[PDB]
């Protein structure tokens, strides 16, 4: 079959046996979707992903898009367009879209489980297919008349983009200089040059593209708060029917050459520079740009983390399948005997260590994103966790930088282990792992770098939140530790240490912040430790959710599981125990390092580096 | 300028101010090469590397070699061939080569500092240039007659390969099935298919190629001990004059498509399968192949480690230059103020943390490989360390798996920080870091995977050695810790690290002994082997950086100014940073290794 190896079994385990998302299925907004239908849809998109979507994964990398600078368009390889059309023909660009836009209502946890398969098989395909999702965000934020346009865009399958970045404004979105000039009739003319814009042209995939552009109204103040958000279509259109009209003044003027994600056209986007106005409409007819655009950023950050996680999963399963069949060397118990039988490399300790490291992080990361998604519907958060909608919203916001920052860094790092398992053959393009690595390196960068994720996590999702979301999650970990049954005692002990280590880091970083009121340079220590802190919280959450999974697996085994199910559950116990014993203790040293941070490295002269 | 950013200053700092290799220069075997000449040599090859060698780094990746099945040859991009001709025209392919083969005698520590520049600028260029070195190894192992051919090869500048691997024989070289059939005239016909052979064809770079090939004589025993080594030239030649004659039956049959290191042609090599025999000559007219071939493997392991270290160094210096000029955001003390002046990103804590991490590992890794090289000459090891030849050889053997395994893994991991510093632009081919990462991934694989390095390090370099080389090195660390305030906290952290590593070694040794009674206990050694190798690497890094800081302090107190002063200040900051941020993790690693169990070994394969 193809490069892409699905894990629907693990999705169903999380969704149904661990988190109990089927509790909300068959009722209320999910009236017409029941559990078994949910399982059928997971199986269907996984087969679709393993077949027609994965089919063009290599082709898109080896035959990347070609730019015509005179027409300002891109030509995509035909195999990839065939995969996109299979995605459209199944309606999968409409998963989780509201019913009034032609969607199938469903909890976000199931939506992201479905999308994982597209992201593991050919992640740029989901990126090109984000149009309908962006249309819903435009609908929610729009005027009544804009809601009509959003409905047309969703129904007609328009593409979409999020246009923030400029050469001088990447992490610092608020330095953007793209300008908006108000017209008497209430439209605006957008003038400037954006860069790194994903999908800014997409060949003939779509009838139109909705660019959602951040720009600064003439005379507005500085920073992100002076930015407004504009609906800037590639083509003007009939506002009543959707019929495409004159080309609007927004043109791709370069396409980047990238390490990976090559089939995803990443564009310099010129507005108002070619003698034709880039007409924009103010989104919701209010100046509230950074807030509106963050509705999109939140989904892109979830998507990017889930992509990284999906990629590690298929990288692990490729490595595992290879290790099961590769014969090399004798068992270590016979390494002195040069006539001993040769064994498959799964017999070797370092290979088993490597594979379990991959497995535990891949499955811990899947649990994290599905756990995060459990707080993205108030009904689900109430049904499975018993929390109100306000706390649910704060917990989801807390977890998003973990999913994005921890997921992206972890997935890339452990794909090193997946590739190593293949030996020399891992370095070949014949196997998919080297492309997984290249495709996933970007996940620590776009949608906000890891350092940006770490600062958001600490400054906004803990300090500004007054630690409510964090205290909730820490309390749920504590309950698991307290409610002994004794077969997970050492794991609970190790978790208790890791929770205390992370509580220490949070208190230390908060202390450096509080001490900055009298010595401003103390705040630098927050920066110095923020990413290590973010990564420690992800390890703690991975450890906890793996341990919860192990507890459910213990129940299912005690009850009499057999066959493939038994092996599945046995692997869950092994992963949780392995993770508790080999990853969690490192947090103690990370606590001590963070408790002792000094500003020596901030005081060093730049010339000394 | 080129992508390649060199660091001759750190090299000379290591060679002359820290280790004192200038003690041996200008006398004896090094009679005619003084310290000024050595420094001019480093600067010249650094210029070459930044100039014509680096010129074709991108070209070799974007326009890679092509296999021609019509001729069973590989075609190389013209720009890379011009880089190769610049290397040859300067004689750099004969550095550290024996004087009698046309080389310039020098200590290995200077040889590897020189080679570092080629490996940073375009590492495949050094790989194609291994011919003369391999010729000297053939000379040292050869019969009287074979020494004449080796001299011809070195002098005509033939290329060379090391031919071991087969599809079923990679880490387990002893499983190789390629066979050798003795002929009435004493030559051998070699019959087999080898895989992943570096440089197995090289277009028109060379007049001939010497393949050094491991193969099993008919009737020989199993395993590596049953293997012999054969000189198998691409063309037959006159054994007296070097005149090239008829084609020998050794053909490239494919070129692999790789993640990186693309301009290095990696080929399936077919011996005796295209209708004419692959005639080989038994090296030394002795059956001793794996021991002879390890003369080559040792140099390849040193080379791979140094390559990875070199690539991290130019990766770091690229990220540093970018960060000094990239303006983004306000200083963190002004983060609330949307009016505040924007700053270059070297003002941001996470960027400074990132850059210092890259710096401390790059310079600690350089110090490690140069330190290792000081044990590769008996004269140097005596002069700078006061060790005799037997212990120097064992210490070198101990450190090789560290240079290779720890160097390769560490360089690739930390290049992630280098790319991160560039932001979104790091993901672009317009900057070199993305190729550095791709070209660097293989360094954990060829010349023996990291797990092979870790097993060699523990079983062969410690246990078989009765821990003598290791106790020697631990004793040097302890001397530094005990000897003579500005480095008190660093020495305290080093003392904890040394005890951590000692505990790791004792725990693993215990697991190995228990295997006399419970054979499965040996699995626990395998489970902890790589983490133990990496921890020793971190300990050596911290110790050598701290030594560097101690020297830096002396030079500052003696009045260093200007650029020198900034350089020395950075050494003190890197040593302090490394000790406080990397070394403490070893304590948690010791505790994990102390409680390893076999649960993961007993798990059913179907549970994964
Ligand atoms: C399921 C449907 C899928 C949708 C379609 C997706 C597919 C698209 C295909 C391609 C996507 C590829 C991946 C994304 C592509 C990109 O990379 S787009 C560019 C990404 N850019 C960033 O992520 C910015 C990075 N920088 C920062 O985040 C930085 O921290 C910012 C810029 C926020 C700092 O500026 P400040 O001005 O200092 O911000 P401040 O803290 O003061 O807050 C101002 C203002 O912003 C809102 N805000 C800030 N942070 C958040 C968060 N985490 N969440 C929501 N809202 C946030 C607030 O309105 C805040 O105002 P307050 O008064 O509330 O403080
Ligand atoms: C200045 C010159 C520049 C470089 C030269 C030109 C380069 C041009 C080409 C560029 C090369 C690019 C990178 C290298 C290319 C490659 O990858 S080539 C293939 C590499 N293959 C390996 O490295 C093998 C990996 N596997 C092992 O090492 C494994 O551990 C082995 C195969 C050793 C296990 O087999 P065993 O049979 O079980 O080994 P054993 O321990 O029992 O010992 C047998 C025998 O081997 C010798 N030996 C073993 N280990 C060493 C070491 N570290 N050093 C020296 N010798 C060793 C011994 O002779 C031993 O016998 P004993 O009686 O002493 O035990
Ligand atoms: C670009 C490139 C260049 C090369 N150049 C050359 C060259 O010039 N000449 C040459 O002869 N060879 C060369 N090689 C071959 C190279 O040395 C091998 O690929 C390497 O030794 C690993 O062998 P393998 O690929 O068969 O992997 P395998 O040996 O099959 O290893 C697969 C996995 O199993 C693990 N493993 C294997 N055995 C054990 C064990 N006993 N204990 C624990 N884990 C184990 C490995 O560590 C790895 O994770 C090259 C390879 C490449 C990719
Ligand atoms: C493939 C790809 C696709 C993209 N698609 C889109 C898209 O569709 N739409 C869009 O709007 N943008 C897009 N981007 C832009 C991407 O979001 C930015 O590249 C990213 O935010 C980083 O900004 P930058 O590249 O300018 O790096 P910089 O902001 O210059 O960052 C450089 C380094 O400095 C660090 N840094 C910067 N500021 C701070 C700070 N205050 N504190 C600490 N560290 C800091 C960063 O962490 C990084 O290490 C894309 C980028 C890529 C690579």
Phi, psi of A198 (to 5 degrees): -70, 130
Domain membership flag for residue B454: yes
State the Cα–Cα distance between residues B84 and B121, nearest whole angstrom. Answer: 12
State whether B34 and B164 are in the same domain: no
Q: Long-range contacts made by residues A268-271, C-beta under 8 angstroms, separation at least 24?
A: A268/A193, A268/A194, A268/A195, A268/A197, A269/A161, A269/A163, A269/A193, A269/A194, A269/A195, A269/A197, A269/A200, A269/A211, A270/A193, A271/A178, A271/A190, A271/A191, A271/A192, A271/A193, A271/A194, A271/A213, A271/A215, A271/A232
Last residue of a domain, one of A263, A287, A311: A287
State whether A564 and A479 are in the same domain: yes
Distance B173 CA to ligand 2 centre (A): 8
Tokens (6 digits) for A418: 């997946």
State whether B457 and B567 are in the same domain: yes
State the Cα–Cα distance between residues A293 and A143, nearest whole angstrom. Answer: 16
State whether B597 and B498 are in the same domain: yes
State whether B129 and B162 are in the same domain: no
Q: Please give the C-alpha separations between residue B596 and each of A580, B522, B528, B589, in angstroms, as whole numbers.
A: 12, 11, 8, 11
State the Cα–Cα distance between residues A338 and A328, nearest whole angstrom. Answer: 13
For every residue of B556-569, DSSP letters joined together read HHTT--HHHHHHHH
Method of determination? X-ray
The owner of tokens 């210096």 is: B317
The owner of tokens 């990564």 is: A535
Q: Please give the C-alpha separations between residue B301 and each of B403, B407, B441, in angstroms, as whole numbers.
A: 8, 10, 15
State the Cα–Cα distance between residues B81 and B519, nearest whole angstrom. Answer: 54
* Residue partners of A514: CB distance under 8 A and separation at least 6: none
Helix (H/G/I), strand (E/B), else coil: B254: strand
CB contact under 8 A, A349 and B608: no
The owner of tokens 């008996």 is: B378
State the Cα–Cα distance between residues B10 and B361, nearest whole angstrom. Answer: 13
State the Cα–Cα distance between residues B597 and B595, nearest whole angstrom. Answer: 6
Residues forming a β-bridge with B255: B267
Tokens (6 digits) for B547: 């030594």
Widest pairwise Cα distance in chain B: 89
State the Cα–Cα distance between residues A434 and A429, nearest whole angstrom. Answer: 7
The owner of tokens 């270059």 is: B344
Q: Long-range contacts made by residues A136-139, C-beta under 8 angstroms, separation at least 24?
A: A136/A97, A136/A98, A136/A101, A136/A103, A137/A212, A137/A295, A137/A296, A137/A299, A138/A210, A138/A212, A138/A231, A138/A283, A139/A98, A139/A101
Contact call for residues B318 and B3 (beta carbons, < 8 A) = yes
State whether B174 and B273 are in the same domain: yes
Tokens (6 digits) for B153: 């090869």
For every residue of B41-90, DSSP letters joined together read HHHHHHHHIIIIIGGGHHHHHHS--EEETTTTEEE--HHHHHHHHHHHHT
Alpha carbon of A376: minimum distance to chain B alpha carbons (Å): 29
Domain membership flag for residue A436: no
Ligand with minimal distance to B127 CA: 2
Helix (H/G/I), strand (E/B), else coil: A212: strand
Chain breaks in chain B (C to N over 2.5 A) after: 484
Tokens (6 digits) for A98: 């509201």
Phi, psi of A605 (to 5 degrees): -60, 140
Contact call for residues A265 and A200 (beta carbons, < 8 A) = yes
Tokens (6 digits) for B530: 């790589």
Domain membership flag for residue B292: no
The owner of tokens 């400029």 is: A166
| A16 torsion bin: left (phi>0), alpha (psi -120 to 50), beta (else) | alpha
| A386 torsion bin: left (phi>0), alpha (psi -120 to 50), beta (else) | left
Helix (H/G/I), strand (E/B), else coil: B3: coil
State whether B90 and B227 are in the same domain: no
Helix (H/G/I), strand (E/B), else coil: A462: helix
Domain membership flag for residue A399: no
Distance A194 CA to ligand 4 centre (A): 13
Tokens (6 digits) for B252: 């490239």
* Residue partners of A168: CB distance under 8 A and separation at least 6: A175, A176, A177, B327, B328
Beta strands in A238-394 (DSSP E): 244-247, 250-255, 266-271, 278-282, 327-330, 342-344
Domain membership flag for residue A349: no
Residues forming a β-bridge with B210: B160, B233
CA angle, corner A583, sides to A598 and A542, nearest 5? Answer: 100
Helix (H) or strand (E) holding B151: helix B144-156
State whether A111 and A155 are in the same domain: no
Domain membership flag for residue A441: no
For every residue of B366-425, DSSP letters joined together read HHHHHHHHTTSSHHHIIIII---HHHHHHHHHHHHHIIIIIHHHHHHHHHHHHHHHTGGG
State whether A128 and A236 are in the same domain: no
Write a three-state SS string for A129-142.
CCHHHHHHHHHHHC
Q: Long-range contacts made by residues B462-466, C-beta under 8 angstroms, separation at least 24?
A: B462/B398, B462/B505, B463/B509, B463/B512, B465/B394, B465/B397, B465/B398
Q: Please give the C-alpha separations between residue B270 and each of B178, B217, B253, in angstroms, as whole numbers.
A: 10, 17, 7
Q: Residue A513, class by beta-carbon neighbours within 10 Å (0-12 exposed, 13-18 middle, 19+ buried)?
A: middle
Q: Residue A34, class by beta-carbon neighbours within 10 Å (0-12 exposed, 13-18 middle, 19+ buried)?
A: middle
Contact call for residues B540 and B368 (beta carbons, < 8 A) = yes
* Residue partners of A228: CB distance under 8 A and separation at least 6: A180, A214, A215, A216, A217, A220, A282, A283, A287, A288, A289
State the Cα–Cα distance between residues A592 and A263, nearest whole angstrom. Answer: 44
State the Cα–Cα distance between residues B448 and A423, nearest whole angstrom. Answer: 9
Distance B525 CA to ligand 4 centre (A): 43
State the Cα–Cα distance between residues B68 and B79, nearest whole angstrom. Answer: 19
Contact call for residues B269 and B212 (beta carbons, < 8 A) = no
Helix (H/G/I), strand (E/B), else coil: A204: coil
Q: Residue A216, class by beta-carbon neighbours within 10 Å (0-12 exposed, 13-18 middle, 19+ buried)?
A: buried
Provide the number of CB pairs (under 8 Å) joining chain A to chain B.
Answer: 270
* Residue partners of B373: CB distance under 8 A and separation at least 6: B107, B108, B109, B111, B112, B302
Contact call for residues B194 and B227 (beta carbons, < 8 A) = no
The owner of tokens 């020697």 is: B472
Contact call for residues B537 and B408 (beta carbons, < 8 A) = no
Contact call for residues B230 and B188 (beta carbons, < 8 A) = yes
* Residue partners of A352: CB distance under 8 A and separation at least 6: A346, B527, B600, B601, B603
Domain membership flag for residue B54: yes
Distance A229 CA to ligand 1 centre (A): 13
Alpha carbon of B29: minimum distance to chain A alpha carbons (Å): 37
Resolution of the experimental structure, in angstroms: 2.0
CATH of the domain at B103: 1.10.540.10
Q: Which atom of ligand 4 is nearest to the CA of B420?
A: 49
State the Cα–Cα distance between residues A93 and A46, nearest whole angstrom. Answer: 15
* Structural domain harbouring B555: 449-608
Contact call for residues A411 and A312 (beta carbons, < 8 A) = yes
Nearest to B512 by CA among A363, A336, A483, A42: A336
Phi, psi of B104 (to 5 degrees): -110, 110
Contact call for residues B160 and B209 (beta carbons, < 8 A) = yes
Q: Which residue of A has its CA nearest to B353?
A: A528
Helix (H/G/I), strand (E/B), else coil: B301: helix
The C-alpha R_g of chain A, in whole angstroms, comes to 25
CB contact under 8 A, B604 and A567: yes
Helix (H) or strand (E) holding A231: strand A228-233
Tokens (6 digits) for A150: 């959003």
State the Cα–Cα distance between residues B324 and B316, nearest whole angstrom. Answer: 12
State the Cα–Cα distance between residues A17 and A10, nearest whole angstrom. Answer: 10
Q: Which atom of ligand 1 is nearest to the CA of A264?
A: 10
Task: List % helix, strand, coil for chain B (3-state, nearest 5).
Answer: 60, 15, 25
State the Cα–Cα distance between residues B251 and B256, nearest whole angstrom. Answer: 15
Euclidean distance between the first and the last CA atom of chain B, given in angstroms as a whole number: 50
Residues from chain A that touch B257, judged by Cβ atoms under 8 A, are 428-430
State whether B494 and B602 are in the same domain: yes
CATH of the domain at A158: 2.40.110.20
The count of other CB atoms within 10 Å of the CB of residue B297 is: 16
For every residue of A558-604, DSSP letters joined together read HHT--HHHHHHHHHHHHHHHHHHHHTTTHHHHHHHHHHT--SHHHHS
State whether A95 and A209 are in the same domain: no
Pairing state between β B342-344 and A66-68? unpaired
Helix (H) or strand (E) holding B267: strand B266-271
State whether A119 and A169 are in the same domain: no
Alpha carbon of A21: minimum distance to chain B alpha carbons (Å): 25
Q: Please give the C-alpha separations between residue B371 and each of A229, B59, B364, B366, B470, in angstroms, as whole numbers.
A: 58, 34, 10, 8, 14
- DSSP H helical segments within A426-518, as ranges? 433-440, 450-455, 468-482, 489-515
Tokens (6 digits) for B298: 């040792």
Beta strands in B98-234 (DSSP E): 159-163, 179-182, 188-198, 209-217, 228-233
Around ligand 4, the residues with Cβ closer than 6 Å are A 161-165, 170-171, 196-198, 258, 261, 266, 442, 445-446, 448-449, 451; B 326, 328-329, 345, 348, 350-351, 420-421, 423-425, 427
Helix (H) or strand (E) holding A229: strand A228-233
Q: How many CA atoms lie within 13 A of B340 on its CB side?
A: 16
State the Cα–Cα distance between residues A296 and B455, nearest whole angstrom. Answer: 50
Looking at the structure of chain B, the number of domains it has is 3
State the Cα–Cα distance between residues B96 and B114, nearest whole angstrom. Answer: 10
Helix (H/G/I), strand (E/B), else coil: A162: strand
The count of other CB atoms within 10 Å of the CB of residue A446 is: 21
Contact call for residues B534 and B482 (beta carbons, < 8 A) = no
State the Cα–Cα distance between residues B366 and B14, nearest whole angstrom. Answer: 8
Last residue of a domain, one of B271, B287, B303: B287
State the Cα–Cα distance between residues A160 and A139, nearest whole angstrom. Answer: 13
Tokens (6 digits) for A311: 């990629």
Write a three-state SS string for A188-203.
EEEEEEEEEEECCCCC
Euclidean distance between the first and the last CA atom of chain A, given in angstroms as a whole number: 50
Phi, psi of B289 (to 5 degrees): -70, -45
Residues from chain B that touch A9, judged by Cβ atoms under 8 A, are none
State the Cα–Cα distance between residues B336 and A225, nearest whole angstrom. Answer: 12
Q: Long-range contacts made by residues A270-274, C-beta under 8 angstroms, separation at least 24?
A: A270/A193, A271/A178, A271/A190, A271/A191, A271/A192, A271/A193, A271/A194, A271/A213, A271/A215, A271/A232, A272/A189, A272/A190, A272/A191, A272/A192, A273/A191, A273/A193, A273/A249, A274/A249
Last residue of a domain, one of A111, A134, A157: A134
Nearest to B319 by CA among B398, B163, B211, B436: B436
Tokens (6 digits) for B103: 């080389």
Phi, psi of A246 (to 5 degrees): -70, 145
State the Cα–Cα distance between residues A471 and A605, nearest whole angstrom. Answer: 40
Pairing state between β B179-182 and B209-217? parallel
Contact call for residues B162 and B293 (beta carbons, < 8 A) = yes
Contact call for residues B535 and B586 (beta carbons, < 8 A) = yes
Domain membership flag for residue A308: no
Alpha carbon of A150: minimum distance to chain B alpha carbons (Å): 30
Q: Residue A164, class by beta-carbon neighbours within 10 Å (0-12 exposed, 13-18 middle, 19+ buried)?
A: buried
Helices and strands, counts by H and E, chain B: 21, 14
Contact call for residues B132 and B157 (beta carbons, < 8 A) = yes
Q: Please give the C-alpha separations between residue B12 and each of A409, B317, B367, B476, B498, in angstroms, as whole numbers.
A: 36, 17, 11, 22, 28
């Amino acid at each position: 079959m193809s490069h892409y190896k699905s894990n629907v079994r693990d999705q169903v385990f999380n969704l149904f046996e661990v988190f109990g998302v089927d509790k909300v299925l068959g009722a209320d907004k999910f009236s017409d979707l029941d559990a078994d239908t949910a399982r059928e849809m997971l199986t269907e998109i996984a087969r679709l992903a393993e077949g027609p979507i994965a089919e063009s994964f290599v082709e898109g990398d080896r035959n990347p898009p070609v730019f015509d600078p005179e027409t300002h368009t891109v030509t995509l390889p035909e195999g990839f367009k065939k995969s996109m059309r299979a995605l459209f023909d199944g309606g999968w660009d409409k998963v989780g879209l509201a019913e009034h836009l032609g969607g199938i209502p469903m909890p976000r946890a199931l939506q992201w489980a479905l999308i994982e398969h597209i992201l593991g098989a050919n992640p740029a395909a989901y990126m090109y297919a984000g149009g309908p999702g962006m249309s819903e965000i435009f609908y929610n934020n729009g005027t009544d008349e804009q809601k009509k346009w959003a409905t047309i865009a969703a129904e007609r399958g328009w593409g979409a983009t999020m246009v923030l970045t400029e050469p001088d404004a990447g992490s610092d979105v608020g330095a953007g200089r793209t300008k908006a000039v108000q017209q008497p009739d209430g439209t605006w003319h957008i003038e400037g040059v954006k860069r790194f814009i994903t999908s800014a042209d997409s060949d003939d995939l779509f009838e139109n593209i909705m660019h959602l552009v951040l720009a600064r109204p003439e005379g507005a103040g500085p920073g992100t708060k002076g930015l407004s958000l504009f609906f800037v279509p590639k083509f003007h259109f009939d506002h009543e029917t959707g019929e495409i009209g004159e080309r609007n003044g927004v043109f791709v003027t370069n396409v980047e050459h990238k390490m990976g994600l090559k089939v995803s056209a990443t564009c310099e986007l010129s507005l108002g520079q070619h003698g034709i106005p880039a007409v924009g409409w103010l989104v919701g007819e209010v100046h509230n740009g950074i807030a509106q655009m963050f509705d999109v950023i939140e989904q892109a950050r979830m998507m990017v983390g889930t992509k990284a996680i999906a990629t590690l999963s298929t990288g692990y399963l490729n490595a595992l399948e290879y290790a099961k069949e590769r014969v090399q060397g004798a068992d270590m118990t016979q390494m002195t005997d040069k006539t001993a039988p040769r064994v498959t490399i799964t017999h070797h300790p370092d290979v088993r260590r490597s594979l379990m490291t991959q497995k535990a992080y891949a499955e811990g990361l899947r649990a994290i994103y599905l756990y995060t998604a459990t707080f993205q519907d108030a009904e689900v958060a109430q049904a499975v966790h018993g929390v109100d909608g306000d706390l649910a919203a704060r917990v989801n916001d807390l977890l998003l930088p973990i999913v994005k920052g921890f997921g992206s860094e972890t997935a890339y790092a452990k794909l090193t282990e997946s590739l190593q398992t293949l030996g020399g053959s891992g370095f070949l393009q014949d196997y998919p792992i080297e492309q997984y690595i290249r495709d996933s390196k970007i996940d620590s960068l776009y949608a906000g770098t890891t350092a940006i994720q770490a600062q958001d996590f600490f400054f906004r999702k803990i300090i500004r939140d007054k630690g409510q979301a964090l205290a909730y999650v820490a309390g749920e970990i504590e309950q698991f530790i307290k409610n002994e049954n004794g077969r997970l005692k050492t794991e609970r002990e190790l978790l208790a240490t890791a929770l205390a280590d992370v509580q220490g880091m949070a208190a230390s970083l908060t202390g450096y912040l509080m001490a900055a009121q009298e010595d401003a340079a103390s705040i630098y220590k927050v920066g110095l430790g923020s990413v290590r802190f973010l990564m420690a919280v992800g390890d703690l959450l991975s450890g906890w959710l793996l341990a919860r999974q192990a507890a459910v697996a213990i129940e299912k085994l005690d009850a009499g599981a057999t066959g493939a199910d038994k092996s599945f559950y046995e692997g869950k116990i092994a992963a949780a125990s392995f993770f508790a014993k080999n990853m969690l203790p490192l947090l103690t040293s990370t606590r001590q390092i963070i408790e002792n941070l000094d500003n020596d490295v901030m005081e060093l002269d730049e010339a000394a580096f």
